[PDB]
Each structure stands twice: as C-alpha cells, then as structure tokens.
Design a protein around this ligand. Structure first.
Ligand SMILES: CCCCn1c(N)c(NC2CCCC2)c(=O)[nH]c1=O
Ligand SMILES: CCCCn1c(N)c(NC2CCCC2)c(=O)[nH]c1=O
Ligand SMILES: CCCCn1c(N)c(NC2CCCC2)c(=O)[nH]c1=O
Ligand SMILES: CCCCn1c(N)c(NC2CCCC2)c(=O)[nH]c1=O
Ligand SMILES: [Cl-]
Ligand SMILES: [Cl-]
Ligand SMILES: [Cl-]
Ligand SMILES: [Cl-]
Lengths: 299, 293, 299, 293
C-alpha cells in the first residue's frame, strides 16, 4: 500500500541481566540500579540519551527488576520524557534489544545505550549532535582503552578510515574499543532479525555494526582521550567510577548526569516543575541542589 | 544460655535518595558483597547461629531471597518487618517472640567492623550471662551518635543521644549485647521528643543499675561509616584495599561458617559451584586446600 | 631610541613555597615535586604550557629546591624546550613572578601557570589556542567550583560579560573561580611593578587582572563543567587528584601530562630522541609507555 | 638489655621513576605525613628510642633536616648512608658500630602497619633476649617477598626469597627483631645470585638453629603495600579514611612520645606551636586536653 512521508529518534536503554558475573553483590538487585556515588547507575546513560535530545525512551530489564526501574523512573512525565518498559527474560545478547523493541521503534531512527555505561566530558552534546543528525546508516564511537580484547575493536587504515570490526579479538588490531552508545537508522530491526547466535549463544551488536560497515554506512567517530568513558564491569571499576564522579561533583558543586537538571536546561520542564521535584528531596543534598539550580546561572 | 541475634536493616528515610530510592541500602554492595554480609558476619564471629533479620515490608522478600533460611551456611535465619522507622529499640518489640527467654545481640544492618582479635572481643561480650555490653569508639563527629561520658577513673557515667554539646568523642557502636531483661525494658519505653523508641534509653536503663559494660573499641579497629555517599565509597575502597593486599575476604559468611565447623568441606564445595566462574566462587574453592592462620 | 618591529609567548611556572600549610608532609620537599599518581606534580602544568605551544619556560622555586627541579627537568633540551630557573627566597605573592621574571620575559607576551594546578579535558588545546592568539590584553579562565570563597571570583552581568573580580570574597557574587593559568601581553611587568602589597602582605594576581579589566582588556573564557581543574590545596584533594589520574590512565592505557609524549606529538622531538628517552626507564611502566608511543597511532 | 632500632630508607632504584626521580620515596607523604613517620612510629611503639636512619648519600641531609637528633621527641637519632642498594642485610654492616653489643630491630622505611594491640605484639617480640623474631602475613603475591613454609603442625620449616613457585602465601613483613648474633651473621654473608646481601639469609641462619620465631600477623592487621604507584595511593586513602572517621592520627610521632612519657605536656605544647595554623598543630594541641583510651 501507499505510504506518505512528511526524523525523530527514539532511545533504548538495555538494563538487563549481567548474569552471575558480579554475584554476590548483584544477587539482590540489578547492576544498573546500583549507585555510582550519589545516584543510580541508570541515571548516567539516561542523561546521555537526554543530552542527545531523545525524549521517547524504552527501558529493557529483567522481569524481576522492571518494577524497581518503574518505581525509580515512572513514565517520565516528571522530567519531560516518555518512558516505556519491556522485559528481557533471558540475556540473549545486546542486539536482542531491537527485536524486543521492534514495536516501540516502529518506523523511526533509534539509539541504543548500555545501562551500565557512563560518559563525561566537554562538548559531548556536540559529539552526540553529529551522530543524531545522520538520518542514514549507523554511528558508533571509538575510545582508546588499556584492554581492547574485552570489547568490539575497530581497525583503521593509514588514512584513519574504519576498515574492520572484531568482537573480543585475542590480538586486537588497535586499542580502539566501540563504546556502548549506538545510533541506527530504520534498517537496524531487519538487520537484527536476520542475525544468528554467535558460538557463545548471543545476538551480537558487533555483527549489526559490521552489516552497516559492509554497506558503507558505518560512521566511527573517535571519542578522544579528554573524555571519560567508564563501564563498571568489575567491582574495582565500579568503585573507581564512584570516586571519579565524587571528585568532580565535590570540586565543581555541580552534578554529573542529573536528569532533572538536563530536562530543565533543555526546557523540557520549567522552573515551577523543577521546584516541585525539589520539594520531596528538600532535606537531602540532591533536593538542595535542584533548588539552587533555579537561582544560579551556569554557563 | 543461648544467645540469639538480630540484624536491624530497616528504612533509612529519604536521606540517601535517589541512590536508595529503588532498594534499601543494606542490600547494596560494599565492594564485592551485599552490605548485610558484614554485620551478619559479625554475629557469626560472636558464635551466633539463630538470627532474625528485620527490614522494611517492601524489602523483606529481597532479604529472604538473598539469605534463605540459613541452612546452607549452618544458620537458622528468620525474618520480620519494621513498618515505620520509629526507633532502633523497636527491634526488641518486633523480635520479642523470636528472643523468648534467651540472651540476645543486636547489630545494625549498615555497620561494618574490621580488626584483630574481634572473635575474642565479641567472646567476652557474648559470655556475660547478666547485664548488657556495648562498645565505645572515638569518632570525629560524636554528635551523630549516642555519646558516652566517662569520669576521671574511666567509668561510664552517662549516655546522651545526639547531644548538641557532646561530653566526649566516644560514640556507641551499632553492636549491642543483652541479657533477658531487654524485652521488658523496651516494652516500658516511651517515644523520645524526636518520636522514636531509643536504644540509648535501653542502654541508660542498664547503666542506672550498674549493669552496662562499656568496653572501648580501640583505634586499631575500624568501625566504618556508611551514613553518607562519601562514607559508603570510603568503606568500599577500605574493603578493596585489604582484600587485594591479602588475597583474603572480609566478612565472607561461607568462610566463617566453614571455620566455625558449621558446614563441612563437602558443603563448602557445593556452595562454591554456582559462582565457580567468578572471583567469589574461586575464593571459596581455594578455601578447601589452603591453611589460613 | 628607535626600535624596529618585525609574537612568541614565554611561559612561567610558579613552583615556590606553599609555606607551612601542608607541613609535615611538605617539610622535606616542595609540594610541586610530590607525585600525582605516577609523575611529579610539576609535569601537569608544564604539559599545559607545552599544549599551549610554549617552549621557552621559566621555573620559579625556593632556593632550597631549585636543584631538585633542575635534576628532574634539566635545561629542557631532552624535550625540545628551553628551561630557565629563578628563585623566590620569600613567598610574597603570585604577581611577584613578573618581577622575578622581568629579564626572562623581556619584550615578549607571557603566560603564568601555578605549579600545583592540573587540567584535563577535551579540546583543551583549542581553549589554550584562543588565549594564546590574543596578542593584546590578558586572558584568564573561569571554572564553577563548590568553594569560590577560596579563589579570585568573577562577577558576570546578565549578558555574560565579566564585570568585577574579587579575591576571596566572604559572599562570592558567583561560583566562578579564576583558574591558575594566565595569559598576558607586554603590559604585565609594568602593572606588577606598580602593585602594592595587600593587607595579607602579598602581591596579588587578582589586582593585575583587575588592572586589565579596568582597561577593557581582560578576556574571561569559561572553562566548562566537562573539564577537570584540580589544584591539590589539601591532603584530601591531593589524594583525589591522584585517584582521578589513575582511573583515567588505567582505563585508557594513555597518560595524562606526559611531557615526552606532548613534545613528540608537537614534533619538537622525533622518534629517535623519544627512543633514547625511553631507554633509561625501559624496565618500568613509564619507559614502556614511551616505547609503545613509537609504534601506535593515537587519534 | 637495650634494644636499638634501625630504619632502612634506602634507594628504590628507578622502579617508581619519574615520580621518585627528585626525592626518595620514604620522604614522600602517605596522606598527611612523611612516609618515614610510619615505620619510625612502629619502632617507638616497640619502646625503642635510640634509632639509626640509613638512607642514600643524596637524601641523608633531607632526613637529617626533617627529624634532627630526635631530642624534640624524646629520641636519640643517628644517621648513616647506604651508597648502593646491595641488600637489606647491609643495614647490619652499616649499623655495626651503632648496634655494638646491644639487641636490635630493623624496620623498612616504606612499610606501614595498622591494627589493634600492636604495642603488645611488638612487646612480646621486643622482650625476647635471645634469637630473632619476624612476622608472616598472608598476601596475594607472595613471590614478591621472602616466603615462609610451615609444616602441618604450624611450624616454620623454610624461607625462600622471591620464589618462582611460592610454598605458601605467607610473606615476611619488613620488621625484624634480632639478638646480639646478627652483626656476626651479616658479616659472614655472601652476595646472592642477584648480587645482594639478603635479610632472608640472615633469617634462615636463625631458622637453622631453631632460633627464629615466626609469629603470624593476622588478617585483622593491615600491612600496607607501597611498592607501586597504585599501592601508594591505596595506602594514602587507607590512612585518610581511618583518620577522618576517628579524629585520631596514625603514626603521629609527637603523640606516641607524649603517651610513652618521653616528652611532657610543656614539650608537646612547644611542638604544636609552629604548625598551630594547620590541622597537624591543631591535633597536637588537642592532645593536651583530651583523654584518649
Ligand atoms: C542540556 C544541557 C546539559 C548540560 N549538562 C551536561 N552536558 C552534562 N553532561 C553530562 C551528561 C551526560 C554525561 C555528560 C551534565 O551532566 N549535566 C548538564 O546539566
Ligand atoms: C571463625 C574464624 C573466622 C575468621 N575470619 C575472620 N575473623 C574474619 N574477620 C572479621 C573481623 C572483621 C569482620 C570480619 C573474616 O572476615 N573471615 C574469617 O574467616
Ligand atoms: C600536542 C598533542 C597533545 C595531546 N595530548 C594532550 N592533549 C594531553 N592533554 C592534557 C595535557 C595537559 C593536560 C591536558 C595529554 O595529556 N597528552 C597528550 O599527548
Ligand atoms: C604508646 C601509646 C601509643 C598509642 N598510639 C598507637 N597505638 C598508634 N597506633 C599504631 C598502630 C599502627 C601504627 C600506629 C598510633 O598511631 N598513635 C598512638 O598514639
Ligand atoms: Cl580529546
Ligand atoms: Cl587499639
Ligand atoms: Cl563543558
Ligand atoms: Cl587477626
């Protein structure tokens, strides 16, 4: 039949099971609800999508913990967002987010962020700007790491063009890891639908990204060393993430990834609504911070 | 006499929100294990196997799911709820049927202890059949706690809850040992001006009868602060540093049960299986074939 | 007499006495020789000047510790720099750097950096670019902090224009502190020469900066929240700086403020010289890092 | 008999360069005080007042300038140099005239100890008039140290320096107590295959004669690692966390002298004056008017 065209990207946060890897610390609750310093882990990737201009977001979690995410985040109306929820009853790979989220995505562009990924740095809005404005193909970011063998790894030719992707190579071609933020056009659901499980029994995002690379439609932007990309894969790195955020916030008197603040600065909520959000937390430092936002110019 | 244990892992208000909006803080990790493993381990080191866990109504199933009936660790665990956070002394009303005619010990669910000869420091406390025992610890900020005043001879002469002008820098820690009088003492308490049933009022009732032993927990012990986001982080880094230096874990309940002979090598081996692919199960397996002094 | 004109900025690092403030930790050696994680504190501001394109640099320190800085840094030839040394026998204020450094500066533009100031973030080169290219007036940077009362504080009007500077105000007009990096034109020595000591008995850099502000020649650029500016004023903040750097380096496998690296990337030293510098440290991680630089492309 | 102390604060090679290019690492701070305050404090807690500080030729004046002749802290300090880092046992050759006919104790200048009843753990070691005493501590990485092997009955039966296949996870810590035999034992040592005069060879000489006491330093003690940039940082954060929780300092020599009655209140007051405007002098002044148990 005839369609009519007259595009506005949706977000997905994958906040499912990290298995038994961090047990016993994660036996009672999902990793993405653990605090990083002063706020739940999922605030950080949520703030990243909000900074990209994305207001319609799907949170994917385990059946057990979906109510906890819903109690925390609600339907998003308090922050000028619309949040929906889906369950992932078995952790079958990152690319499953597109099958789980097929009806949510519909015919729109999308962005996937991992619920345990934290980003920090200057001009990040503009880094997210470039990817968000590409209405065709896929956009990912590459970041120099110590241990690229843990990640999807990008190989560049002498001219700096991305030429191959390898998932967890034993002998990485570079130290550039693909970060856990991915922008896709309308092709991604069909690409994901045709994936077959890897030997590990997982639907791999690296295979989705290679499909775009083979089409000549993968943009790989470098996220430079002046940004911090942290992912909280071990108890040690979780502690380090906490200390990192605390050092920054206590130095600056500003918070990293405060969703209320980002919504207020994006003009998705106004002063009066921000005042209402501050009221219940008025006796703790978080509520006091929200109140200070109303009567301070921050450049 | 038998001494039963109680862990009070109740509601911390909105003080650490939004970090604790989704889950009570005693279920959050300090480094590599749930916070509640630490006070549970303190009770187990004191020789206590029958333990009541008190939490909010919402989070009890999460404590029940986490720890079970205790049989896997040679423990006998029970659960109860504190509907509203109306004072630590409420633990003894909630736990009255659990305690019965036995001796008791209460530990706060967010308190972490570290140091040498803790098994022996708890032992002296545990073996007193009469009176109550508490521990006093020198802190920077005594006004946050129950504060002990001593006379020139070193005798405890008063207790004040959150004094505006503290009489000393010695705070009462979150571990309390009680004889058979405590339930009856708790039952006669009235709410404070702040509206709570105060453990300090329980402790003063013992003090007035000369039945409160206040032992100093020395500066060589760590009693770690988890009252702020800052202190939470510091405690994690503290545990991290010790464990990574030593290759030994702090407050591993499976290990403590094994060393107490509450479970045998065959049971420890079964416990190590599920987590065999990560650091915790690996640690438990190594316990079977290493002598640790 | 007649002059002839046919400009190339010099750097000064003030690494003098921080008095008895951090005693006993600093009784045996200067604060600016204390390590921040894996390298001496002074590497960080030195790297900042190098990133600004500055190769001719004066290090000002106490008479007692000048030999220690000289043993560490030499005459700079190893890194494609020219380093000179001057002493500050009494800590009489930051603005004294221009009197001490008068002959060194000569008729050139200059930049002053505090020897205990660390900077980190994306596009910092370009932030330093704007200030370095202003051949007239002065340039400073303002950074939102928790405790502006400890600093020189900038007041902005509703349009964002800097309108006043106050040194350690009890009731700060804003939370924007002036950071410890200052760019000056040829007027600064004369401005400094005419300063009188403040009530505290110090020649104040805030007075130098106000002189420029009153002339309409002070540029105040915002250093945004996506940058880290740390200054190591307490034992606590020193520890935090150390942890911050360690988290970044161990995540990335890249070093912050490695002068050898910056000189190599600026083409002030070539591959062969970098190889020579790596040789003496070849058995430790620092030397191994220098060696890796030669056979890796870092974007 | 009198027991004299030695702190070996010698050269650490190029291992932590460039961080330590300008100054030896034992003069760098761990949090709020020079690293050497920590092992110095360990000797003072052991009751030792006559102490020889051994350092590189370049940095001795910096140790001399820092600590003086010790008279301000009720100590008797002397200095000597180790020209080349050719083994820890060289301390006994360098210190031979200092030691004379007395008992001795050696502590490494980069070793930090924390825990309860340390004064008493050093006391038992200090009061043995014959033989040698060392402490063994469970670590993650025994291959970095002198490693102790025990038989099934718990008896130390061998020592190996940096074994490729360690026999246990028990490392010998950097505190050693010796009788009058050690100088003569050190004098007869030959360099190892690695070219050093090994303290482990000294300790094995005592072991062969059944005169080596190997006491376990339990997991409730912290023996902190300052061998890497990472472990340096961890130690600082460790001290920070304790001191900020307690409002008491770890290894404050002025405080320890005061408590040992080696200096009186009038002397402590004079010591507090110079630093009266910062946290350290403030701490010292507060010591005059607070009872700390
Ligand atoms: C729309 C204006 C947003 C300004 N902003 C911002 N960019 C960030 N950056 C953080 C967010 C994701 C981590 C980088 C932040 O944490 N808080 C903010 O208020
Ligand atoms: C019955 C033998 C138990 C020995 N033990 C022990 N004492 C502790 N320490 C305690 C002291 C600080 C809280 C943990 C521990 O964490 N794990 C153990 O296995
Ligand atoms: C000329 C190319 C330099 C690239 N670079 C760089 N910009 C920094 N940024 C750091 C330096 C001052 C702290 C920000 C660094 O630490 N190491 C580097 O190699
Ligand atoms: C003679 C009474 C001394 C009491 N004392 C003491 N034991 C220590 N602890 C020691 C144990 C860890 C190294 C510091 C300390 O740091 N400061 C002190 O004043
Ligand atoms: Cl960058
Ligand atoms: Cl103690
Ligand atoms: Cl920014
Ligand atoms: Cl112990």
């Amino acid at each position: 039949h005839h369609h009519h065209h007259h595009m506005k990207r949706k977000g997905i946060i994958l906040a499912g099971g990290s298995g038994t890897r961090l047990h016993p610390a994660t036996l009672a609750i999902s990793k993405q609800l653990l605090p990083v310093y002063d706020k739940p882990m999922i605030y950080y990737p949520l703030s990243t999508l909000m900074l990209a201009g994305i207001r319609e977001i799907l949170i994917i979690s385990t059946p057990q913990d979906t109510p906890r995410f819903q109690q925390l985040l609600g339907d998003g109306s308090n922050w000028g967002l619309d949040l929906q929820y889906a369950v992932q009853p078995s952790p079958d790979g990152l690319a499953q987010a597109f099958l789980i989220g097929e009806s949510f995505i519909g015919n729109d562009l999308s962005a996937l962020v991992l619920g345990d990924n934290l980003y920090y740095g200057h001009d990040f809005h503009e880094l997210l700007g470039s990817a968000s404005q590409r209405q065709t193909g896929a956009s990912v970011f590459a970041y120099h790491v110590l241990d690229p063998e843990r990640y999807g790894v990008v190989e560049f030719d002498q001219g700096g063009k991305a030429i191959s992707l390898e998932e967890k190579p034993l002998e990485p071609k570079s130290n550039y890891a693909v970060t856990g933020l991915y922008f896709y056009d309308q092709q991604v659901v069909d690409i994901a639908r045709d994936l077959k499980p890897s030997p590990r029994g997982e639907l791999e995002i690296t295979d989705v990204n290679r499909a775009y690379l083979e089409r000549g439609q993968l943009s790989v932007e470098i996220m430079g060393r002046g940004y911090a990309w942290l992912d909280t894969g071990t108890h040690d790195s979780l502690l380090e993430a906490g200390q990192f955020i605390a050092t920054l916030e206590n130095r600056q008197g500003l918070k990293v990834a405060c969703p209320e603040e980002i919504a207020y600065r994006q003009k998705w909520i106004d002063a009066a609504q921000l005042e209402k959000l501050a009221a219940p937390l008025a006796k703790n430092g978080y509520g006091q911070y929200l109140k200070r936002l109303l009567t301070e110019t921050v450049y």
